[PDB]
Every structure is written in structure tokens, then in C-alpha cells.
Amino acid sequence: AQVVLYRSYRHGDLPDIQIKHSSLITP
Amino acid sequence: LHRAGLLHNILPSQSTDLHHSVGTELLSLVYKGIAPGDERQCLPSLDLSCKQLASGLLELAFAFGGLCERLVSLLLNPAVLSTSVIHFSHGEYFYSLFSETINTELLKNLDLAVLELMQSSVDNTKMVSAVLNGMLDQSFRERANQKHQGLKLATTILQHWKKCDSWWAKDSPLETKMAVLALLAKILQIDSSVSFNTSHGSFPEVFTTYISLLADTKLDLHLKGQAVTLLPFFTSLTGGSLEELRRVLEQLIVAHFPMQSREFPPGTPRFNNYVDCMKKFLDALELSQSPMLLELMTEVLCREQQHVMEELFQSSFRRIARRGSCVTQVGLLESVYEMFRKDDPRLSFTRQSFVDRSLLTLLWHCSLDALREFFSTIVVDAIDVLKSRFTKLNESTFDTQITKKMGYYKILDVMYSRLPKDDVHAKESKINQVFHGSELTKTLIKLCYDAFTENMAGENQLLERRRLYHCAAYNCAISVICCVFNELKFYQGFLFSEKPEKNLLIFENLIDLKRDSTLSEEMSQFDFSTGVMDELNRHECMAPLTALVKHMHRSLPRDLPSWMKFLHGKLGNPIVPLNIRLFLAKLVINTEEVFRPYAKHWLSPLLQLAASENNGGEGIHYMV
Amino acid sequence: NPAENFRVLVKQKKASFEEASNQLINHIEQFLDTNETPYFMKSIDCIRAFREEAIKFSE
Amino acid sequence: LIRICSKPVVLPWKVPTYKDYVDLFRHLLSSDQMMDSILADEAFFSVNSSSESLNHLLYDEFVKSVLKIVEKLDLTLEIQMIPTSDPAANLHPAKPKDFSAFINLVEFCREILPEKQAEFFEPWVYSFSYELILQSTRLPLISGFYKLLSITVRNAKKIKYFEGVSPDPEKYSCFALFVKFGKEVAVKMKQYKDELLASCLTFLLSLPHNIIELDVRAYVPALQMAFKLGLSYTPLAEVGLNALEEWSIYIDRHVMQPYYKDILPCLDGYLKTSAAISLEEIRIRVVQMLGSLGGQINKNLLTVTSSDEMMKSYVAWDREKRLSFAVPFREMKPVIFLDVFLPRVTELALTASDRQTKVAACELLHSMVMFMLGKATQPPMYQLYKRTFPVLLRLACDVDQVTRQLYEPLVMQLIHWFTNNKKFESQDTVALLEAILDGIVDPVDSTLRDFCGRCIREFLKWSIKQITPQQQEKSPVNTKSLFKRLYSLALHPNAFKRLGASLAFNNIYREFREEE
């Protein structure tokens, strides 16, 4: 088989709570 | 205690120099416990724990001295033992059991024991071979731990080698001779060449023995063929014997090796012996890289066409060129050259085989800055030959001369494809021994060009030869135009009534017919212990002209250079021979990319030909 | 080397066997430039023996 | 044989393999249907010495050859910026070719050795062990010893060598030597990992009753962990049940039942999940063997109950529901609390099949922790932090390099956030306490202890550039209180904290050495 994935979140020094609802919706 | 070294303080009084306190029990246990006889026993029982305890007590006994002569006497007991009625001796049996401890002991004391064994070896040989095999295998396992061991063993052997006359005497059994051959080969492969090859001790004597066995008619082809493998340690530090080696191996070759190998098909025993001997000689010579044997090899190679699996020797040539010191390989080059420019009345085809089957793949993989010195040495002689020997025509000897010229032209092609024009250039050339050795490079262009171009004489006794001659002239022109005159406006042969291309191409030929590791080291150690394209071949110039096309491309819209403009005029006139047209068409096929913007101009010449004509048969062929 | 081979072959039957002539020729022309003088001596001695054989029978 | 040790390995003309020979040596071990024909067609065995079955000599010659070969071959490892904790890590073979060939030979012999009846092996059962014990004493980290001695003791029990041992002098010495070796390797069991842990399990679980009768309580946790791993790998449970039958039939129920309380329960999950060796015949085996016992005897699988709050985990991670979320829609936005999902999603992110349930669970947990971080700008999740971040550090050191690659940047980002001035008081204290009191104390998870070491080492950064030292003094949290906590853990009698503190400083070396 092989991996499946849906979001490689952006990299920084802190999280960005600017992310939309859809990102929490899909998982 | 022995590691402490206070054994003698506790040793009981030895009435004799013999360590009887340990020697008596040694004999009374080893010669009785294993003996099936004297008690009507069937090999009295022994245990593995008893075996390791025996190894321990034997190294204990070796901690005692003054026993070597006793051990020699005990092992030299051909007292036969009977098991169930088969028979075998006793001392050899015990040695076969405990060769490990025996070899350790003989390592401890060697020179006296070696001398006693080998002076008493005039009658018996087998355990001598076995013990020396143990010596070599132990010291070759331990060669990362001690190195002087085998060296001093070799010195001791060479010190007394004359007693080996029971072996290699030309009335001894063939088994005896091949056994002594095996043991000497082993001891020499563990030894360094410098420790032996220098004129010292028995090296002249054992060398004469080696010659005598290599000259022994009692030995057959195969035996001496296996013997010759130690050549790399005899190729150097030999003087006067070199011609002796030459004569002996020459008589061996002439009395044992037929000129043709295909006459005996695979499965012929002599054919298989032939191939095994050539392989053995090849690998040993490649290890040696001695100029003399290289001459022997280049003269056995080139005596026919496609008769000795030449590709293996090409691989050997490229391997040798990739290796070897500069001065050594240079000397090999002059050695292979000396008879090649010599006037030995070789057959023209045979001599061109000499040059072709070696030199091209020799230099094609050889490192430069060593080839240059050879070129400087040979340039004067080569140009002197290339400026002379044209007058006579009326026998095949001049065909041989012009064949040597062919060789000159094609070799000039092949090595000038490799070098820039810095030491060979106009007005500055450190290597120009013709002019000053400091300027002149221009005469050679005219000299090769006027040879390449010739108004076709009505007579030609060397049709294929003169054809390939003008081919080789064009090839050296290809090289000199690849490295010199790289500017635009190159030259094409025909100007007026000279017709150069017809002396390059064969006619009346049906052409283009229808379509490391300790375990690996130990394994090698025990092994030494036992001592074990069609339409691209129809011509030659397709690759050089593809190189020329890519070279001018590197030097580089309806653009039409003059030469390819004539090639448009060419291929469009059916009156010119269709063979010339199909050759040039193949060359155009090989390099379509430059003609891609100009194929519209090229449409008329390719279109005009083959509308209804032949292309080496009818229609469908390998080129559509 | 086929020299003694055809020598044995003919003396088995005391025949001419012109293939013997071809093979002995092939062993002969080789000594034109090469210093195979030992091999030339071998060939000529085989020729001596085959000449004796030719004296024997109708050869 | 040293040729055959150069074969290619297999994973759990064309290039050959070891198996291409194994049957042949069985055919060589069973050369009784083939030498019979040769001796029948021959009449030479009148003045000949022997006419017996030489398969015994075949086995002896093979054994002496392999003995001297393994004595010849040698195996060793080497090391290697960053120090490593466990001696099983930072190991690189000095000559890996020897390791590979040793592999080749061990999985070559593993099938050939046991099939033949071991009366041929009887004279070796002592000797073959001794130097091999030597080979184990100098190099106690080799799986071959354990598994080859497993098949060795199987052959010995096929011959019954350990029967009637003195409380024969040779039998007495060999039995005592194996007893002491078995007890010491049982003690050392705890430090081994897979492909080395499993092998020594097969070893210390293949021994005959003559040794189990001496000691049981030491093997009780060994049996527990072996059977909890047999769920993941059935052969462990299979040989475990075989050993259980061996000693249970052979030893009276007078000294094992005080341990039956904690002996039995580790089997429950075998029969709770489903309706060569498969879990189904595993269960059917335990089925009849359990029924062979009496009622009160097999009542002790329910004894694991003191952790009923641990299996419960239904104590609210956040007592009040602080994870309100209105799903965006057209005319309806139900407000949903996410505290109830925490236990189930924890065991999904930890234990899930298809290898894709875990990654989607990771995605949702990223999203939901992100949403609760956004929400926190309005409740005390003190209890939530204490109870939830330990499983986060549990998943920090997951074998999945994808998981660590996902998680460690988040770890360092939350480090940046926590050691900031606005997050340096009274809300990081819960996170720091739960993160230090778990993950370094564990008897397992050396990788987790190392990861904690590295993350605290990098936590030193931004503990000095985001907090001015005067604020470190004003805030009750400072280097001094950390020093007292480190001293208190270091002095703790449990050696886990001692190794944790020593390894913590070993990590902070090249970082604390710059402190002046």
C-alpha cells in the first residue's frame, strides 16, 4: 500500500489560528 | 607456568638433553592410544574433549625443548596400521590428527628441523608437503600478525635447496614433480618477489630447476601450462636468462600450440587445453606487465583473423593501460613498437593485425603524459618513413609498406583524437622534434591530404588495400580537423579530376541486404592453501563523421554550407554510382539533427534517389 | 601437429590421403617470416618419415 | 558452510538463497533411504570397516564444523555530535559483512537443526553450550543464542537430558550452569527490544519444567508480557501455552497458585476480539486448556481490577465542557462539546489498523487542540493539561517517522509559546510538571526519555531570550526551582530518575557548558 494524507500544516514559530473551518471539518 | 617461564625449576632431572619426562609420555600415549594394533582393537576410542586436551598437552610438550629430533623420528614411522582390514601407516596418521600443534611447534624451531626433515626427505615426500602447507596456511592466516616468518622460511629453504634433487629430477614420478611444483608455487606466492627474484642463494639454482621442468619433455603441455603461472616473479631481475626464457617458451609454443584454434571445435580436449593455457598465460602476464612477454603475446595474437578470442586481449589491453607506472608502460610501448616498425617480412594482413589488434585499444585507454614521450621518440622515424618508400609497386612487399603506412595514418587519427594542440602547434610546439623541439605543424596536413586524394589510376594491384589506405588518410584528416582547423569553412575532398572518394569505398558488393571481511579473507586463504552492428561495420567512417558533425555543431533560417550544398548536388544525380549515394545517405541518416532545419533543402537529393531503384536488393531493407 | 596424425592415419592403411598433403602444406607455409625453425625442423623430419613411407608403398 | 553463510537474506542464473539447501541437508540428515540403496547394490562391505547408518556421523561432522566456524568468526559493533542513551543505540557494526553472514547462517540452520532426533546431539548438549555460553558472556546481545538454544532445548527434551538431575555430577553441573544463566538473562530481559527481545522470550519460555519448578515469580511478569505480545505475534503465545502445559502437568499446583492471581488475566484480550499459527487456534488452545482446570483455579483472570479507574478514564478530562463548537450551516449551528471523544481518540491515535486511521486521528487532534487553544482566550484546563499531554509525549516517540516529523515541530513551537513571558506563569507549570513527571520516569520508552532530553535542551533556548533574568526572579518559576526539582528526582531511590537526571545533563552538555 501507500500513505494517505490531507494537510501538511504550515511551519513557523507558533501556530496560526487563522486556519479555516474546513481544515478541522475534513478529518 | 610456561607463560611465567619457571618450568625448569619444577622440571624433574632430565638425564639426557631429551625432555624424557614429557617425551616418554608423549610417545607412550600418542603411539599407543590411537593404535588399533598391538591389542587387536579397532581404533581405540577417542573423545572430542580428549582431542582438545591433547592439543593442550601437545602445546605443553612444545613448552619443553630438545624434542624436535624425537618428533621427526616419530613422524617418520611408516608402521602400517590395520583397521575391516584396510591398511595405513601410523606417524602420518598422528600428524594428520594434530597438524595444528605440529605446525605451531615447527614455527617455534624451524631451521634445524627444516634441515633435518629435508635431508631425510630424499625417500619420503608426502608429509613434507603437508607440513609445509601447514606452515604457509598458518603464517598466511598470521600474516597480519607476523611477516618475517615466511621470509625466514624462504631463506632457510633457499639455503639448502639442493637436497630437493629427489624431486624435479627427470626420472622422478610425475606426481613427485607436480607436488614439488605446487609447493614451490605456494611458497613463492606467499613470498615477496624481491626476497627471491634478486640474484642470491638458490635463486639461480632454483631458477635453473624451474627452467629444466619448464623444458622437461616428461611434463606434457598441461603441466608446464600450469607451471608458467609464476612468471611475474621471474620477469624481473633476470639477465641473459631472458633470451633463455625466450628460447624455451618459444620451443614450447612451436611444439605444443597450433596456429589455428577453430580447427578443433569446442569439446576437443586439446582445444580446451589451448584455451586454459592462454587464459593462464594472460592472467599471469597481466600481473607481470613485462615487455618481453608482451612481445610474445602480441606475436601469438596476430597471426590470423578472428582466431583467438581477441576481445579478451582487448580487455587485457584496456586493463593494462588503466594500470602500470608511466615509465613501465612507455617501455612496453617501445618494446611492442620495435618489431612493428622492424622490417620482418610479415604478411601484410598479418602485420596490420599486429598493429590493429593491440595498439588501438592499448592507447585508447592509456594515460597521457606518458604516451607523449613515446610520440616524441617515434615522431622522427615515423615522419621519415611517411616521407619515403613510395617508388616501387611490382610486388606485395610494397603492399606491406603501404599497409604500414595505413597503420601510421590510422594511429595518427586515434591518438591525435586525444591531445590538444599545445606541444604540437604552429609557431609554438615544445614537442616538434622535426623542426626544433620548441613551431611547425603544417606540412603534415599537405602530406596526408595529397595521399588521401589521387586521380584514380587505371591500374590497382591493391584494390581493397589502396582503398583502406585512402580511408586511413581520411581518418587522420578527421583527427587533425577535429583538433586543428576547428574554424568554419572546412575542406571537402574533390576539386577537379581527382575523385578522392572512390578510393575509400568498395564496389560490386551486395551491401544492405533485405531486412574487507575476515570470513572472505579466510576463504581466499584456504583457497590459496589448496592453490585454486550491421551497416555500421560495412564501413568505419560513420562514427568519425558523426563526431565531425557534432564538432561543427559545437562550432555552430535557411543555412546551407558549401560542402553540404555539393552533397545536395550529390545524391541528386543518378549517374554517379548508387553505392556512393547509399553510403552518403547512411551518413546523412546518422546525423539528421543538423539537417532538421535544412531537410527541406535536403528533400531534393534524398527524393531523387531510390524512387524506383535498388537499395541492396528490392525495397524493404534494414534501413527503412 | 596433424603431421604425425596423418602419418599414423596413412600407415594404418598405407594410403596417399591427399588431405595429408594439404595438412602438411598448412604446417609448411607458416615458416615464412616467423622464427619457428624448431617447428620447421619438426615439419621436415615428419617429411623424412613420410618420404620413407612413400618409398614403402605406391606413393 | 562458510560458502553457504554468504547467501542473501530474506525479510519477515538468479541469485540463490539459503532455503535452496535446507531440505537437502534434511535429505542429508535423512540419508537413510539413499545410503541403503548404495549399500544394497554394493558388496564391498565384507572387508570394509563400517556398514552402519552414517547420519549420526553426518550430524557430528556438521556440528564440529559449525563449532569451529563460529569460533573463527567474530562479531562486534562500533559507535557513531549528540549523545545517545541506551547501549543498544549508537551501534554500528565494525564489520557489517560478518553480521550479514552470521544472519544468513542462523536462518539457514534454524530449520535444519531441530528436525533430526537429537541422540546425535546428545554428546554435544554440554560441550556445544559451554563455549557458546562463553560467546554469550562476552556478547550478551545476540538473538541467535536465544533462538538456537530454544531449538536446542527442544531437541534436548526430545532426548530428555535434564531428567534425574542431581539436587549425575555432569548433569548436575550442566543443569546448574543453565539455571544460573537463565536466571541472569531473565533479570536482563527488561533491556532488550524487538528482534532481540522476542528471541530471548522464546529462549526463557522454552526451558523444561526442571527449571520452572525452581522459580516462578520471576517469570510471572515475563509470562504476562510474553502473552500480551502474543496478541501481536501468535507464536509467542503458542510456545507460551506449550510451556504452561509442560510445567503445569509436571509441577503440582502448590507454589504457582499464589501467583495465579496475576498469572491468568493477560489472556483475556485473546478471546475478546474475534468470533502456521493464527489467533483463532491460539484461542481454541487456551479454551480447552483453561477448561482442563478447576473452577476456583481459573477464577484468577479477573484479578486485574485495581486499575478500574485507568480502564475507565471516564473522569472528565475537563470537568466542565469547554470545547463548545457550532458547526457552520445554513439555519442551524449546534454547539458541540469535544471532551467526551478524548479517550477513544487517544486509543485510536495509539492503536489503530490500516495505518491510515492513525494519520486521520492525528489530523483531527491537531485541529481540535488548535481550536481549544483559540478558545482558551476566554477556562482552566489545568486538569485537561495534566491528563492529556502525557499521551502526547507518549506519541512523541512513535516508531512512525511520519508521526515524529509531524509532532516535533509542534513541540518546539509550543516550547516557544510556553517559555514566553505571557505564558511563563501558572499555566505552563501544569504542562511542565506533567511533561517532566512522565516520559523520563518510565521503565520503557528510552526513545521518549531521549526526546524529552532534547526538547528540554532546546527549551533552554527562549527560556533566556523570551524571559529576562529579572523576570525569572520575579516569576516563581526559575532555574533555581528547576534545580531543586532535579535534585529531588535524582535522589529518588528508583534508578529510573537517577538515569533520567544523568542523561538529562549528558544532553545539556554542549549547552550548559556555555553557562558562565
For residue B82, the SS3 value is: strand
Contact B229, B215 (CB under 8 A): no
Name the DSSP letter for residue D5: G
Residue B563 CA: distances (Å) to CA of B569, B582, B585:
10, 17, 15
Spatial separation of the C-alpha atoms in residues D174 and D267, rounded to whole Å = 34
Alpha helices in B531-577, H assignment, sequence order: 542-555, 562-569
| Other CB atoms within 10 A of residue B522 CB | 15
Grid cell for residue B57: 598437552
Q: What are phi and psi of B351, to 5 degrees?
A: -65, -40
Q: Which residues of A touch D416 (CB under 8 A)?
A: 13-14
Give the phi and the psi of residue D135 in degrees, each rounded to 5: -60, -30
CB-CB contact of B124 with B111 (8 Å): no
Taking contacts as CB-CB distances below 8 angstroms, the residues of chain C near B299 are 34
Q: Which residues contact D335 (CB under 8 A, 6 or more apart)?
A: D324, D325, D326
- Put simply, the answer to whether B254 touches C36 (Cβ < 8 Å) is yes
**Residue C1 at interface with chain B, using a CB cutoff of 8 Å:** yes
Q: Which residue of B has its CA nearest to D60?
A: B48
At D326 the three-state DSSP class reads strand
Q: Name B81's bridge partners.
A: B88
Instruction: Indicate yes or no: CB of B86 within 8 angstroms of CB of D47.
Output: yes
Beta-strand relationship, D77-78 and B87-88? unpaired
| Rounded CA separation D295/D403 (Å) | 46
Q: What 3-state class would DSSP assign to B118? A: helix
Cell of B342: 622492424
Q: Are D418 and D431 in contact (CB under 8 A)?
A: yes
Instruction: Work out how many CB contacts closer than 8 A connect A with D.
Output: 41
- The label of the residue with cell 511551519 reads A11
Is D417 an 8 Å CB contact of chain A? yes
Return d(Cα B412, Cα B386) in angstroms, integer.
Answer: 12
Cβ separation B345–C1 shorter than 8 A: no
> Which three three-digit cell numbers place residue B320?
593494462
State phi, psi for D72 to the nearest 5 degrees. -65, -50
The DSSP call for residue D92 is E
What is the number of other CB atoms lying within 10 angstroms of the CB of residue D38?
10
Helix (H) or strand (E) holding B214: helix B203-214
Residue with cell 558452510: D1
β-bridge mates for residue D325, sequence order: D336
CB pairs under 8 A between B and D: 38
Distance CA D82, CA D60 (A): 50
D223 in Cβ contact with D266 (< 8 Å)? yes
CA angle B119, B121, B122 (to 5 degrees): 85
Do residues D289 and D241 make contact, with C-beta atoms less than 8 angstroms apart?
A: yes
Cα–chain center distance at B32? 55
Instruction: Write the DSSP string, D463-505.
Output: SSSSS-HHHHHHSS-SHHHHHHHHHHHHTSSSHHHHHHHHHHH
User: D336: part of which helix (H) or strand (E)?
Assistant: strand D335-336
Give the experimental resolution in Å.
4.6
For residue B436, give every residue at least 6 positions away whose Cβ sits within 8 Å of its Cβ, in sequence order, or none: none
Residue D388 CA to residue D329 CA, distance in Å, equals 31
Residues in chain D: 516
Strand (E) or helix (H) holding D325:
strand D325-326
Gap between the Cα atoms of D262 and D301, Å rounded: 7
The C-alpha atoms of residue B327 and residue B318 are separated, in whole angstroms, by: 17
DSSP letter, residue B225: H
CB atoms closer than 10 angstroms to residue D417: 17
Chain D residues whose beta carbon lies within 8 Å of the beta carbon of residue B519: 2, 5-6, 72-73, 97-98, 101
Distance CA B504, CA D283 (A): 88
φ/ψ (deg, to 5) at B469: -60, -55
Cβ(B94)–Cβ(B129) below 8 Å: no
Q: Which three cell numbers stand for residue B27?
A: 610417545
- CB contact under 8 Å between B250 and C38, yes or no, is yes
Cα B314 from Cα B302, distance rounded (Å): 12
In this structure, which amino acid lies at residue B399? D
Beta strands in B293-426 (DSSP E): none
- No. of helices (H) and no. of strands (E), chain B: 28, 2
Q: What is the 3-state secondary structure (H, E, C) of D416-446?
A: HHHCCHHHCCCCHHHHHHHHHHCCCCCCCCH
Q: Which residues pair with D335 in a beta bridge?
A: D326
Could you tell me the CA-to-CA distances from C38 to B241, B273, B274 in Å, in that order? 19, 22, 20
With beta carbons under 8 A apart, name residues in chain B contacting C32.
345, 347
**Residue B397 near chain C (CB below 8 Å):** no
DSSP bridge partners of B88? B81
Grid cell listed for B180:
614439488
Distance CA B119, CA B226 (A): 28
Neighbours of C (≥3 Cβ pairs closer than 8 A)?
Answer: B
Residue D336 touches partner A, C-beta closer than 8 Å: no
Q: Which method, experimentally, gave rise to this model?
A: cryo-EM
Run of H or E residues at B153: helix B148-159
Write the single-letter amino acid at C20: A
Beta strand B81-82 pairing with B87-88: antiparallel
Helix, strand, coil percentages for chain D (3-state, nearest 5): 60, 0, 40
The position carrying cell 590459496 is: B528
DSSP structural state of residue B425: -
CA–CA distance, D339 with D384 (Å, rounded to integer) = 9
CA D148 to chain centre: 19
* Separation CA B197–CA D453 (nearest Å): 65
Identity of the amino acid at B30:
V
In a mutagenesis test of the D interface, which of A6, A8, A14 is the best target, namely the one with the most D β-carbons within 10 Å? A14
From CA D349, how far away is CA D395, in angstroms rounded?
8
The C-alpha cell at B503 is 578510393
- How far apart are alpha carbons D339 and D319 in whole angstroms? 9
Q: Which of B255, B259, B347 sits opposite C38 (nearest CB)?
A: B255
Residue B573: CB partners within 8 Å, gap ≥ 6?
B608
**Residues from A in contact with D at Cβ < 8 Å:** 1, 3-7, 9, 11-15, 17, 19, 21, 23-24, 26-27
Amino acid at site B297: M
C29 vs B: CB within 8 A: no
How distant is the alpha carbon of residue D324 from its chain centre? 41
C-alpha torsion sign, points D362, D363, D369, D373: positive
Q: Report d(CA B192, CA B202) in Å as an integer.
A: 15
State the burial class of residue D86 (Cβ atoms within 10 Å of its Cβ: 0-12, 13-18, 19+). middle
Q: Residue C42: which residues within 8 A CB-CB, separation 6 or more? A: B254, B255, C3
